Every structure is written in C-alpha cells, then in structure tokens.
C-alpha cells in the first residue's frame, strides 16, 4: 500500500502516499535499515527535466496548458541539440525552494516558501562569485534579521569545471591542529585550516577564528578570499544569571550558511549554490559547543557550575548543557540576532508536516535529524513517526573538490 | 555488501558482517526509510539452523550431538507437528532472543539472565504462581536481576497461553465525563478489560492493575498481585522538597509480559522478562511524554520556571529534576536503576564485544538513543544497522 505514519503523542494516523512518488534509492534494503549512516545520458536527463518542468506546471496550477506542454517541447529540443537545457529564471526559484521542501534532514521547512533566490548563473571567476557570497552574506544577515537565502553559480556542463566553494560553510571557525595532536578551535575544520594554510592564510591561534573563503572558478586552483570582519556577525556567550560563563569567551557566528551541497534540479546540477537560513540554538549549544569531538565544553561547564562530575547519576552532564544551551538561546536574543528553539522548531516542523500532508501526501523527513540533540522526547516530533526518502529537487553531498 | 559503520565521536570505522545473516525482513526498501515506525514442516529449516547456531555456540559443530539432535528434531516434528527444545537449548534460545533485540540499551547483560522453565503450566493459576515467582525473584528485595518465565510454546490445535497485561506492573488508568485521564492514559484499555473481568477499580494515580492471564481455550482470569510482591518507589527529589509531595511513584521491576519469543521455528506467546530501569524511561517516558502521566508543566510551575516561553528551557530543566529524582529515589530505597549515561556508556561496551564476538550488532539508534541529553551520550555518534536475527522477541496481536 503506502506506509501508515502514526503520531503517538495524538493517536493520530496518516498514510505517505508521496513515498511512492520517490526516485533515487536510498540505502536500506529488506535486510538491514542504515538510516542512521550520515553518508549512506540524454533519455535519463529528459526524464527528470520532464518531471521538474510538470512540477513548476502543478506549483502554479497550470498543468496541461499550452505554456506547460510548449516548455516541455522547448526543454525536449535543447537537450536534443546540446545534450543538456537552461532552467528559466522562475524554474530555478521554483527548483530551490523545492529542494529545500525535499530535504528530509531539515527541521526548518516551515519556512520553505520564503527563501530568498540569488541568480548567479552568468559568474564567471572566484572573484565575482566572491562579490556574489558577500552580497548573500550581507543580504542574509540583515543585521541579525536573518533572512533564508540562497544563491545559485553556474550548473554543471560538459567541457568546463564546476564552480566549487571548497568551505563547508560560509563562516567557519579556525581548527588548528596543536602539535600534541589536540584542536584550538574547530576541530571540524581542521582540514579545511590546513588548506586555507597551505593556499597563502596567514593563521590565528584564537579558537574563533573565521576563516577565509577557497573558492574554486571552472578549472582553476581555489582563491583565497577573506571574508570583511564587518561582514561576519558573531554573538559573543553570556548566560543570563551565570555571570562568569562570560568569562568563558564563548562567541558563535549569526549565520548557518552551508556551501558544499550540490543543488539538483530537473536533471541539472549546481555544484555551487551556498544556502543559508537561521541558528536552532541545540546545533550552537548542544552539538558546536558540547559534542567531545567539537568544542566540548560541556564538563568545564558543569565544574564551572559545581556540580558533581565524579558521577554520571548526578547528571551534571544534562544540567550543564542546558544552560549551555540557555546561554546560547539568551546571548542572541541579547544581541537581537534571529535564533530558534528546538521547541519552537520541532513544533513549527509538525505544522509543516500537517500542510504537506494536505498539499502533497506526505513530507519526507529524517527522524534521526529532525528530533533534536537534547531533550528529543519532550519535542513533538519524536512521537511522529516519519518516512524517509529522496525526492527532487534535492540538496545532495558531493565529494570535496581536493 | 557489508555496511561501513562510523563512530563519529572517535573516527573509527567497522564493518558489520552480521547483517549477512539477517533471517526476516525488515519494513525499510530502497524506496524509503521506515526505521522511526514503532510498528512496521517448513519448521525444521528454522529448527536446523537454531540447532546449528546452538552447537557452533558451544563449538560442538558437525559432532555426533549436533547431528543425533537434528534427527531428534526430525523424528518429532513427523510424530507430532511441532518439537520441544531441550532445557539448555531453551536457556540458550532466551538468551540470544535478548542479545538480537535491535531496540534494548540493555544487552551488555545478555550473558545473565535466569530463564525460568513453565513449559509444564496448565491453567491460569499455575500461570500466577509462576509469575509471583519469576516476580520474587527478578525482584530481590530490590537488588534486581534479570529474569524470563517461558510458557508452553503455541502448537496446532490448541489455543495459546497469554498474559493479557502489556506488563506484569502497570498503573491503572480511569476516563471522566471531561474527557481526560486518571492514572496511566497508557493503560485505559487494560484498566476497562479488567473492569469488564471483575477487578473493582480503584481511583488513585498509581493504581496497580490485576493480571488478567489466559490459558489455552478459556476466557482470561483475574489475578490481583500481593501488595508486598510489588516493589514501588515513592519519588522525591534530594533537594527540591516538594517534589515528595506531589505523591509521584513508580514500580521497581520493568516486566514486558506481552512479546512472543521466539526459538528455532517455535513460538511462545507468553514469555514475560524483566531487567531494571533505564531512569529515563521512568523520568522521560513515562511522567513526561503528553500522553502519559505529562506531569512536566507541574514541576515546571513548582520550580518557578518560565513556563510562557519555550526558551527559556523549562522543558529542559523540569525534565532533568525529575530524572534526577528518579535516579536519587530508587538509589534511596536500594532499587537497581541505571542512568542513561552509564547505560549507553555499557552498550557502547557491548557493541565492541559484539564486533569481535559475531561481527556486528542489531541496532535500532532511533531506541538506543536515550530520550533526553542524546547527543551527550556515545551511542548517539555511534552509526548503527538494524536487522532481524533468531531467536528473538516479536510484537505479537493483542488477545482480543
Ligand atoms: C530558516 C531556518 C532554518 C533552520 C532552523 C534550519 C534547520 C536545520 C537543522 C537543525 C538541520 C540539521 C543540520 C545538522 O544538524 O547537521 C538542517 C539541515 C538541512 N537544512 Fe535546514 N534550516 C533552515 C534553513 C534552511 C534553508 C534555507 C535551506 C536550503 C534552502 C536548508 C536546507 C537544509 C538541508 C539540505 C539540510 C540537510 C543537510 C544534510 O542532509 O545533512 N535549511 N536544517
Ligand atoms: C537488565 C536491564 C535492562 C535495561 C536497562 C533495558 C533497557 C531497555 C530499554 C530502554 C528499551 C527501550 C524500550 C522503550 O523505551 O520502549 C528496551 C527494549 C527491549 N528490551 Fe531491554 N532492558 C533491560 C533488560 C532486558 C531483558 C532482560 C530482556 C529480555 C530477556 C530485554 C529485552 C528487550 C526487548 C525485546 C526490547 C524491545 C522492546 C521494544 O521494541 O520496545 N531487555 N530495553
Ligand atoms: C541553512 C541551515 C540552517 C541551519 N540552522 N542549520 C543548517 C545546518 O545544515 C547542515 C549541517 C551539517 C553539519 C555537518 N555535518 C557533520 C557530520 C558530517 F561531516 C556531515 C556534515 C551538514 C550539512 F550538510 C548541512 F546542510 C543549515
Ligand atoms: C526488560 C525491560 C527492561 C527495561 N528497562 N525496559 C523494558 C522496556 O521494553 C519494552 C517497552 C515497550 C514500550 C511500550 N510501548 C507501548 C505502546 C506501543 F505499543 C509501543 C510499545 C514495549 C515493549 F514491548 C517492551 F519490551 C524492558
Ligand atoms: C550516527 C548518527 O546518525 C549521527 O551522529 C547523526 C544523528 N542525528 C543527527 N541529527 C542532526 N540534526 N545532526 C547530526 O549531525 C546528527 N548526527
Ligand atoms: C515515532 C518514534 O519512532 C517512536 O515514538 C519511538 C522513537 N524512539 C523510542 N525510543 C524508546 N526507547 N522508546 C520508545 O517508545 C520510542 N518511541
Ligand atoms: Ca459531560
Ligand atoms: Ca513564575
Ligand atoms: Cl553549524
Ligand atoms: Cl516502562
Ligand atoms: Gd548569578
Ligand atoms: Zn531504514
């Protein structure tokens, strides 16, 4: 049939009739579930084109109309000519905001209709895709009025490189691998350090150093471009009544702006096409600042806060990442950059699922990424039950570009 | 073929090889990921290879034990339909039905657990004395110790021994003219039944049910438990004083009752076990999920919490009072209760051990994965796969 989805904490039942709809396969067989794994041609291209063009047609309900049925012939005798096709600009919008519809990991898909679609498709060096990202930062923060975004360098074609941001992200901080072997800073981006290093950046020692831009134009070894301080808000950590948390010297950046993701709309691909949106306070508090491969904060913390680490009953561990976690939901609010709970999130996220649930059948999502990293079972997503599959438009992990 | 499986806290990459063996199917396909979804004579082949996992586990393989019990098996399955396992094997099988459950933190322990035979019940009243029992028992005067009573397997022809309760100690649950529920909303349906079956009910909170236990081809019997079997723990908080008074208990012996194992193609429907606590199941689950005992905003509000605006984390720091209190009142009155940290700690432990024993190990991260602090505990960064092995415990209808 279709699978029965259940809501516990409500009794509730649906059925994802859109599940059926899936296309690329994903990794689980009747044999054996991987969905916890992080990182589990003409005739073909044509299918999908069709497909995403009868997409755009539904979206705004002209479906079998002249212009639907003419847009298709046109797509059909470019492909034919030069083995791919050009979106038109309302396509791409369309396209990028579908992918984000479609991203099964991502919890803020309330907001997927109002996403911002910057049209970089005529870039031509790293140096205008530089001019491009600083106006995606600049448009995208807003002062702390953070505003979801994405802009879209040119797709993937025959004969030419591929525009590549090498950064996993717009900012990023510093890892740089001490000589015992340890991190100061990010150890998540010790790698990417070593070759901002390694490409003429002069290094830091702090552990919030925001590093440079690698950006990578069509068959050319990545630039190194240094993102304008006054470009990359930060919100240093304050707790609201734990005064010496201060002293820390906690900060985190305003902006989540992933670059590495390949953009994949009716069979064309855009390698580069950074995306950005707003903080939920668990990634900064809870996995950035806590996770023992990351900053981990968590037990200088709790003996910060004299609690009583010696054992695990106490639950130090949970008392201090929590106020981690108000200290982070608190110091944006302070320095009025826009920052979601995981309470707030989750519940907007059930909203989401209701609309798609009316509007298409189902919503595919990730149950492992969408319950938050603290107090999953008191958010409502963790009683939903989910099915996960991959639609397109889709944002999809690439190999890195080195 | 053989799943990579990162741990992303330390780097290290396995390889699980036990898949390879996985006996059913399980509800995902390549099309979609159902792993979230709480629910998703041709005999002897399933006999022969239990056989054959039991005597390569003894490393008596190919021997003349191993090749004279298949033909015992054989010959019993032609005389009679189905076959009975010998003791051991039945020790054997129940253990191993534990050390496949993909969704139990609990498994470090798989190697100690007492397995009571009641192959020989007949009756629901031998039913309750093999249950006061395994309950005396796998109690201990609250020093508790894993435990499973086996019932006579389901053959052809006859009806099905079934214990009724979901649990051997569940709290009532009552509905009113406003809708809502008294006691555990968990248990509304189980609380009527016994109702309907004659139980008088009683109007607390933390009313214990009565065990409705069926024996083959009769109609399901009240039990009322002893009071003095079923060990409670008043629950206070070491230093929120009130919290006492909010009169919250909960029972000491987690004892599912409602499963069927299942061993080398047999089927027992009543099998009931018992470990101890995970505090977070008590604490998170069972007083906190909305529709369950969802006492959160009511420590919200007596520790003073922000409760009008989510960020503020009253969730959060309510949650973790209440498992604390969890934790320090079972440790209070000598109860055996372990914390998630330790638990996942100790699974973390036996997923190592169980790489080197057979090569991987089942697991469902969706319930290893503790409800509260996920990400604060290993098995969180612990890439898991999930499949079926026998013998194991299955989901069975419920009796009506
Ligand atoms: C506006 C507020 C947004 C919030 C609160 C949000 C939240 C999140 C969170 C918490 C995750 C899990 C990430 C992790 O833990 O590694 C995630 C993943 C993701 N987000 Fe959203 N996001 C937002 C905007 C966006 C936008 C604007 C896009 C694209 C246009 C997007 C696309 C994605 C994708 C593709 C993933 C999955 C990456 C993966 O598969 O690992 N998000 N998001
Ligand atoms: C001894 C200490 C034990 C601990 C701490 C423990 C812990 C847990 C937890 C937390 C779950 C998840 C259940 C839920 O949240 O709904 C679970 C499930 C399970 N346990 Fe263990 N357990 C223990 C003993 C046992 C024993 C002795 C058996 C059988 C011999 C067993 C068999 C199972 C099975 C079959 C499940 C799956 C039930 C389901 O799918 O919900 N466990 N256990
Ligand atoms: C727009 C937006 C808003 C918001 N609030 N949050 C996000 C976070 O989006 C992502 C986060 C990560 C984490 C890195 N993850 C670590 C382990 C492995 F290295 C795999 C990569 C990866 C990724 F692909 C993402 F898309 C995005
Ligand atoms: C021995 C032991 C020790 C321990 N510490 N914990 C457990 C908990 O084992 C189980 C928990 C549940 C959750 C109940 N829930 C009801 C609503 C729906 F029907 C889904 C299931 C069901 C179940 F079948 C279990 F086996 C067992
Ligand atoms: C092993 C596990 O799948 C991995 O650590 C996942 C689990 N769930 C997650 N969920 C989110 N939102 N983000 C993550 O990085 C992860 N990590
Ligand atoms: C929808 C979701 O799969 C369901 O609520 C699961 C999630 N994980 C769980 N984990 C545990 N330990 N116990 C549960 O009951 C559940 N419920
Ligand atoms: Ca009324
Ligand atoms: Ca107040
Ligand atoms: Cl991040
Ligand atoms: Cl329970
Ligand atoms: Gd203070
Ligand atoms: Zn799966």
Same mark, same amino acid.
């Given at each position: 049939?279709?699978?029965?989805? #259940? ?16 296309? @690329? ?18 005739? @073909? ?41 050009? =979106? !038109? ?15 099964? /990991?991502?919890?803020? !898909?309330?907001?997927?209709? #109002? ?5 970089? /498709?005529?870039? *031509? ?12 930062? #600049? ?16 797709? !993937? ?21 001490? $000589?015992?072997?340890?991190? /100061? ?12 290093? @390694? ?31 006054? =470009? ?18 906690? /900060? ?34 809870? *996995? ?29 561990? %949970? ?16 320095? #009025? ?19 798609? $649930? ?19 079972? =008191? ?20 190999? %890195?570009?080195?």
């Amino acid at each position: 049939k279709f699978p029965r989805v #259940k809501n516990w904490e409500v009794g509730s039942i649906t059925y994802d009739t859109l599940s059926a709809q899936a296309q @690329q396969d994903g990794p689980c067989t009747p044999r054996r579930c991987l969905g916890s794994l992080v990182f589990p041609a003409p005739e @073909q291209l044509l299918s999908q084109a069709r497909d995403f063009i009868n997409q755009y047609y539904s979206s705004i309900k002209r479906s079998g109309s002249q212009a639907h049925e003419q847009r298709l012939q046109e797509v059909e005798a470019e492909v034919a000519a030069t083995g791919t096709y050009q =979106l !038109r600009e309302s396509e791409l919008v369309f396209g990028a905001k579908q992918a984000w519809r479609n991203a099964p /990991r991502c919890v803020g !898909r309330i907001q997927w209709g #109002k996403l911002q679609v910057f049209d970089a /498709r005529d870039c *031509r060096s790293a140096q205008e895709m530089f001019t491009y990202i600083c106006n995606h930062i #600049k448009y995208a923060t807003n002062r702390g009025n953070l505003r979801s975004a994405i802009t879209v360098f040119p797709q !993937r074609c025959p004969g030419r490189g591929d525009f590549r941001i090498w950064n996993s992200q717009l900012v990023r901080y510093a890892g740089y691998r001490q $000589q015992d072997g340890s991190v /100061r800073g990010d150890p998540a981006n010790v790698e990417i350090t070593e070759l901002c290093i @390694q490409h003429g950046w002069t290094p830091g020692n702090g552990r919030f150093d925001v590093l440079p831009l690698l950006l990578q134009a069509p068959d050319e070894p990545p630039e190194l471009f240094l993102l304008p301080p006054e =470009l990359v808000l930060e919100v240093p950590l304050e707790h609201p009544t734990l005064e010496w948390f201060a002293a820390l010297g906690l /900060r985190w950046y305003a902006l989540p702006a992933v670059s590495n993701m390949l953009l994949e709309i009716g069979g064309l691909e855009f390698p580069a096409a950074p995306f950005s949106g707003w903080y939920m306070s668990t990634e900064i508090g809870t *996995r950035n600042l806590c996770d023992p491969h990351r900053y981990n904060i968590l037990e200088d913390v709790a003996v910060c806060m004299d609690l009583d680490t010696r054992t695990t009953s106490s639950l130090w561990k %949970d008392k201090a990442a929590v106020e981690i976690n108000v200290a982070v939901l608190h110091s944006y609010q302070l320095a #009025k950059v826009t920052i979601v709970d995981h309470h707030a999130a989750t519940a907007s996220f059930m909203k989401h699922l209701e609309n798609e $649930q009316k509007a298409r059948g189902g919503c595919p999502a990730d149950w492992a990424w969408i319950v938050p990293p603290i107090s999953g079972s =008191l958010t409502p997503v963790f009683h939903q039950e989910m099915v996960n599959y991959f639609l397109s438009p889709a944002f999809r992990y690439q190999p %890195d570009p080195w």
